C-alpha cells in the first residue's frame, strides 16, 4: 500500500528485507529461548551443551524449535523461477514460507519446499569449504615462503637470511609467546 | 553432459567490460558437422554521444554496426530496418535508443557497400571488391544464424530474427525485461 518509508542508507526493498529478517530472527530467538527454558536437568542435549563437549544452544533450538531461515549468499531464497522461488507459490510472494523460512524443527520434520530450501542452504556451505581449502592453502604457502628464514639471533635481534635487522627484539620485548599470560593493569582505569 | 540450449536468445549484463549489455544466440542447424555458430548483438557501454549497438558475427574479427548488417541483408531504408527491429512505432523510448545506431550507419547506404564493409573486416579480405562481397554474402547466408536458414532467399527470415535479437537487447537495456539466468535449467540441455 506504499505506506512504508525507506530507512537512511537503504532503499525500499532493502528496508523491507531488513524488517522481515528482523521479525523472523526475533521469532527464531524467542522460540529458541523457550526451547532452552523447557529443558530439564536430565536432558542429555543440555548435558552436552552445558559442559561444552559438543553442540550449542542453536542446535537445541533447531532440534526442538524452528529450524529458521535458509539464506543463499546472505539473502533469503532467491526467485529462481520467474518471480517465484518454486512453482508451488504465487508470483511475487515475499512471505516467510515462500522465501525459505523453515518453521518446523528437525524432530517435526521439514515440508517439501522447506526440505529443498534447506538443501540449498547446505550446498552453500559445502561449496564454501571446497573453495576456501585451495584459497587458504595458497595464502599459507605464500606466507611461509615470505617469512621462513627469519629467526632470533644470539645478539637477541630478529634477522632474516640476508642478516638484515627485522626487529631489534623479538616482539619488541624479547619474550617467547608460550609463557606470557593475560593480566590486568590496576593503575590505568581508576580515577585520581 | 550439460550444455547451454541452442537457438535461444540470451541477454546477460557484464558491466566489467566494453559492453553494457550483450545478447547472444548459439544458432545450430538440425544436423551439421559444423559446430554451433554463436552470434552476439551487444550495446556499447557509455564512456561518443549515444550508445551504439554492434553485432559480432562468426568469421568476422571486428564488430560491425547492426544497421550495416541489416543493410547487407537487403534492407536499405531506415523505415524497413526499424520495422524489423521496433514492432511498436508509438514507443519513442526504443526509437531514441536506436537513433545512435542509425547515426553510426549513414555513409553505408547500399547493400553492396555494406557487404564490402563486412568483407573488409573478414579474416582474409580480398583485394577485389567482388570477392569481398562474395565472402560477406557467403558468411551472412551460411554462418549467420544457421538455424534460421542456410539456403538462399532466406534474407527476410534472417532479418526478422536479427531484429528480434536487437529488440530483446533493447528491452533488457530499457529495463522492460529481466536478464536471463545462466544457471536456469531450460536454458540447458
Amino acid at each position: 500500500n506504499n505506506e512504508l518509508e525507506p530507512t537512511p542508507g537503504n532503499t525500499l526493498r532493502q528496508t523491507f528485507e531488513n524488517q522481515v529478517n528482523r521479525i523472523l530472527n526475533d521469532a527464531r530467538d524467542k522460540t529458541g529461548s523457550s526451547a532452552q527454558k523447557s529443558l530439564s536437568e536430565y536432558n542429555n542435549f543440555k548435558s552436552m551443551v552445558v559442559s561444552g563437549a559438543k553442540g550449542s544452544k542453536i542446535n537445541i533450538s533447531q532440534v526442538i524449535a524452528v529450524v529458521g531461515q535458509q539464506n543463499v549468499e546472505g539473502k533469503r531464497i532467491p526467485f529462481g523461477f520467474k518471480h517465484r522461488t518454486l512453482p508451488h507459490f504465487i508470483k511475487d510472494d515475499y512471505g516467510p514460507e515462500s522465501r525459505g523460512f523453515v518453521e518446523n524443527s528437525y524432530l517435526a520434520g521439514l515440508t517439501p519446499t522447506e526440505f529443498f530450501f534447506h538443501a540449498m542452504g547446505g550446498r552453500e556451505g559445502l561449496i564454501d569449504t571446497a573453495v576456501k581449502t585451495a584459497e587458504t592453502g595458497y595464502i599459507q604457502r605464500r606466507l611461509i615462503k615470505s617469512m621462513e628464514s627469519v629467526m632470533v639471533k644470539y645478539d637477541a635481534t630478529v634477522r632474516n637470511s640476508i642478516n638484515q635487522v627485522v626487529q631489534l627484539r623479538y616482539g619488541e620485548d624479547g619474550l617467547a609467546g608460550e609463557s606470557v599470560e593475560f593480566q590486568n593493569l590496576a593503575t590505568l582505569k581508576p580515577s585520581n | 553432459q550439460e550444455k547451454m540450449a541452442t537457438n535461444t536468445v540470451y541477454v546477460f549484463a557484464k558491466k566489467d567490460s566494453k559492453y553494457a549489455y550483450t545478447g547472444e544466440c548459439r544458432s545450430c542447424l538440425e544436423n551439421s558437422s559444423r559446430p554451433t555458430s554463436t552470434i552476439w548483438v551487444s550495446m556499447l557501454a557509455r564512456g561518443a554521444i549515444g550508445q551504439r549497438i554492434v553485432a559480432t558475427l562468426p568469421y568476422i574479427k571486428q564488430e560491425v554496426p547492426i544497421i550495416i548488417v541489416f543493410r547487407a541483408l537487403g534492407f536499405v531504408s531506415d523505415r524497413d530496418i526499424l520495422e524489423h527491429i521496433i514492432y511498436d512505432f508509438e514507443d519513442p523510448e526504443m526509437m531514441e535508443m536506436v537513433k545512435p545506431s542509425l547515426d553510426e550507419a549513414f555513409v553505408i547506404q547500399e547493400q553492396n557497400v555494406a557487404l564490402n564493409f563486412i568483407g573488409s573486416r573478414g579474416a582474409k579480405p580480398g583485394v577485389t571488391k567482388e570477392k569481398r562481397i562474395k565472402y560477406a554474402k557467403e558468411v551472412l547466408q551460411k554462418e549467420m544464424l544457421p538455424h534460421v536458414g542456410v539456403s538462399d532467399f532466406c534474407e527476410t527470415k534472417k532479418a526478422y530474427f536479427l531484429g528480434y535479437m536487437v529488440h530483446r537487447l533493447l528491452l533488457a537495456a530499457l529495463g522492460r525485461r529481466e536478464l536471463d539466468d545462466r544457471d536456469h535449467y531450460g536454458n540447458k540441455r
Binding site: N10, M147, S161, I162 | -
Partner: protein
C-alpha cells in the same frame, strides 16, 4: 549498513598489497559542533559525497527557440521576459537552441543546493562563452535555461548536456561514491577522553563512513578530525602518511581481520609479519613480486616461484 570485506578475501587483499581493494572506505571523525549535532554532520557529509548534476536533475530537453522574448513555454516565457528587460546583451551573439534542465526539489533540499551554486559551477566549468539563466527558488519548479553564445549548435548542445550531467561536480570529492553517517554503538569508534576526575569516558559522536578513498582531501577538509581520520586502504596510507603509518595501519587491519571472529593471535606474530612487509621502506607484498625482488639468493627464490626464470637471470 555498508558492506565491508572480511575473512580470507580481506587477508588476501592485505598481504598482497592490492591497489584496488573490493570495498575501500574511510572513517571520518568530526572535530567541533559537527561531532555533536546531526545537522552540521549532514552538512559535512554533503561536502564529502560526490554530487554530479545528474543526481539532482529531473529531466532535460533541447528546444528550438527563435526569439527568446517569446519562448515555447508559458511560464518560461513569462519569467524570461521578466529577465529580458533590455538589450543588456549582444543580440547577435545568441543561439536559438535552448537546453532546458528541470531539477529535483527533493534532491536539492537533501543536498542543500541552490540554482545559484549550480550556475556558478556551470560558469566555472564552461566559462562566459555559454549563458545560463535560473529562476527563483520560490517558483513551482526548478528550471535552468542554457544557451551558447555566438559544426551545428544542435549536436553541440546535446554533447554539452551529456557531459554536464556526468563529469561536472556540484559537491563532494570525486572518488567518494557514497558517505554514510552514524553514531557508533561501540567504544572502539567512540571518542575516549579522560575527565577532570581522571576517569575514562566514551563520548558518542557522529562519524562518517565513505565508499571511496580520498584520504588526503578528506583530511584537509575543515571540521574533519585530521588525527583520527583513517582509511582501510593501506596503499593510500603509505602514499599519504608513510611507512611507519602504513606499518601500524596494516597491523590494525590484520588484527581486525583475525579477531572479527573473536579469535586471538599473539601480537608478536602480527608484528613480525608487518615488519617483514615494511622493513625495506616500501610495501613488500607477500607475493612472487614482493618476495623475489629481495636480495635473498637465487636458490632461495627458485624454491618459491619462477624457478627457471630466476635461475636463468642468476
Amino acid at each position: 549498513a555498508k558492506n565491508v570485506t572480511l575473512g580470507v578475501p580481506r587477508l588476501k587483499e592485505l598481504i598482497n598489497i592490492s591497489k584496488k581493494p573490493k570495498t575501500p572506505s574511510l572513517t571520518v571523525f568530526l572535530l567541533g559542533q559537527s561531532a555533536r549535532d546531526a545537522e552540521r554532520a549532514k552538512d559535512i557529509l554533503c561536502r564529502l559525497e560526490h554530487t554530479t548534476l545528474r543526481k539532482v536533475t529531473a529531466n532535460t530537453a533541447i528546444y528550438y527557440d527563435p526569439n527568446p522574448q517569446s519562448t515555447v513555454v508559458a511560464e518560461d516565457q513569462e519569467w524570461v521576459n521578466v529577465y529580458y528587460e533590455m538589450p543588456d546583451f549582444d543580440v547577435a551573439r545568441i543561439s536559438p537552441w535552448l537546453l532546458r534542465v528541470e531539477l529535483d526539489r527533493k534532491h536539492m533540499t537533501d543536498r542543500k543546493l541552490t540554482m545559484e551554486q549550480i550556475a556558478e559551477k556551470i560558469n566555472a566549468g564552461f566559462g562566459d562563452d555559454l549563458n545560463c539563466i535560473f529562476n527563483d527558488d520560490n517558483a513551482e519548479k526548478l528550471v535552468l535555461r542554457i544557451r551558447i553564445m555566438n559544426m551545428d549548435d544542435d549536436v553541440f548542445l546535446r554533447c554539452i548536456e551529456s557531459n554536464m550531467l556526468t563529469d561536472m561536480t556540484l559537491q563532494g570529492i570525486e572518488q567518494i561514491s557514497k558517505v554514510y553517517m552514524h553514531l557508533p554503538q561501540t567504544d572502539n569508534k567512540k571518542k575516549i577522553i579522560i575527565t577532570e576526575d581522571g576517569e575514562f569516558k566514551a563520548l558518542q559522536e557522529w562519524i562518517l563512513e565513505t565508499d571511496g578513498v580520498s584520504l588526503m582531501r578528506v583530511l584537509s577538509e575543515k571540521d574533519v578530525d585530521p588525527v583520527r581520520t583513517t582509511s582501510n586502504d593501506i596503499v593510500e596510507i603509505f602514499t599519504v602518511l608513510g611507512i611507519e603509518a602504513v606499518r601500524k595501519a596494516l597491523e590494525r587491519e590484520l588484527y581486525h581481520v583475525i579477531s572479527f571472529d573473536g579469535s586471538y593471535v599473539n601480537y608478536r606474530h602480527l608484528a613480525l609479519l608487518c615488519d617483514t612487509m615494511t622493513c625495506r621502506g616500501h610495501l613488500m607484498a607477500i607475493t612472487r613480486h614482493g618476495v623475489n625482488r629481495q636480495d635473498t639468493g637465487p636458490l632461495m627464490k627458485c624454491s618459491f616461484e619462477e624457478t627457471v626464470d630466476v635461475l636463468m637471470e642468476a
